[PDB]
Amino acid sequence: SMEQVAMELRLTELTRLLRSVLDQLQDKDPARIFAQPVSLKEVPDYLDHIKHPMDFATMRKRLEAQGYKNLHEFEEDFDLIIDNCMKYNARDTVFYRAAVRLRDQGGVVLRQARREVDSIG
């Protein structure tokens, strides 16, 4: 149907916007602490602690498969990256501190992204 095509065009445009957002958020992780899944070889007990692991590479896979239907779903995954890290790692670690900085700097990006998704529809 034409409606389905129209829908798919919207999803494609959302994906385009979210790809820009993801690039901007990952730029706020210059240490690449969140670039890849936490290694279950280097941290064999990780899944005993964290029930829903997330990282930028995994988000990017879902993104390019057009797997985010709305901004909320994308934000859920971004928040997992930060929240998982702030539980597994103590306050006095470069890991926890990187998550705080990513959350703080990311807020600006996500604030405008929400306005853009709304405005453009």
> HEC profile for 65-103?
CCCCCCHHHHHHHHHHHHHHHHHHCCCCCHHHHHHHHHH
Q: Measuring CA to CA, which residue among 32, 33, 58, 50 is closest to residue 87?
A: 50
**Which residue's CB is nearer to ligand 8U4, number 33 or number 71?**
33
88 binds ligand 8U4 (CB under 6 A): yes
**Encoded amino acid at 96, one letter:** Y
43 binds ligand 8U4 (CB under 6 A): yes
Q: What CA–CA distance (Å, rounded) separates 78 from 38?
A: 15
Task: Single out the segment in contact with ligand 8U4 by CB under 6 A; choices: 2-10, 36-44, 57-65, 104-112.
Answer: 36-44
How many residues bind ligand 8U4 (CB under 6 A)? The answer is 9
| Least Å from the CB of residue 36 to ligand 8U4 | 9
Q: Which of residues 44-83 bind ligand 8U4 (CB under 6 A)?
A: none
Positions in the binding site for ligand 8U4 (CB under 6 A): 33-34, 38, 42-43, 85, 88-89, 95
